[PDB]
Amino acid sequence: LGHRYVNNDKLSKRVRKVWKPQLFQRELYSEILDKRFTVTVTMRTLDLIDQACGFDFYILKTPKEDLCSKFGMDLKRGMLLRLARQDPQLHPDDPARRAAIYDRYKAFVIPEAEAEWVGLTLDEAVEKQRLLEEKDPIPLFKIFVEELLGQLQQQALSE
């Protein structure tokens, strides 16, 4: 979003102008997730995929800032999880293909605690952490019973 001078003479009218990317419908194949997604991409995306030599490469090999998509970060979170888990459900019938594929991507393998937090919005993160911390408050009967057993076992051991 910006402005331009008409004719490029600085002395002409100054005019608001917006330059929009040319978008395409293309279906891409992910090896690790074993799937064909129909995605809107640019010619630039295709050139970066070409340059990084694979779709899955391009997704793993690029930082959060450079993809810019929440969907890119979710693709990445997914296949990062599939790599850290070594998920058998990738190719159930052929462990040959499975090891073969998990092989080339071994550079990006990261631990599990890390891999599920990669593509997350602050919202999604806060939610997730709230769910892990979800506990029904412990009945005071329990706590009072444990204090009482402490006291009774120290009354029994003192004599």
Partner 1 sequence: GADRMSKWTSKRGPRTFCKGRGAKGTGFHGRDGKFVQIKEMIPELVVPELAGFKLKPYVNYRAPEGTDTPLTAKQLFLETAAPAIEKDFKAGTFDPEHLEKYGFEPTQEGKLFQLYPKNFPR
Contacts with partner 1, residue ranges (CB under 8 A): 139-141, 144-145, 148-149, 152
Q: Distance between CA atoms of 18 and 2, rounded to whole angstroms? A: 6
> What is the chain's length?
159
Distance in Å, CB of 135 to partner 1, minimum: 15
Taking the least distance from each CB to partner 1, the nearer of 25 and 158 is 158
1 touches which of RNA, partner 1, none (CB within 5 to 8 A by kind)? RNA
Closest CA to 73 of 131, 115, 123: 115
Helix (H, G, I), strand (E, B) or coil at 132: helix
Per-residue burial over 36-51, b = 16 or more CB atoms within 10 Å of its CB, e = otherwise? eeebebeeebeebbee
Taking the least distance from each CB to partner 1, the nearer of 121 and 151 is 151
Q: Does 13 bind RNA (CB under 7 A)?
A: yes
Distance in Å, CB of 140 to partner 1, minimum: 5
145 touches which of RNA, partner 1, none (CB within 5 to 8 A by kind)? partner 1
Instruction: Identify residue 59 by its one-letter amino acid code.
Output: I
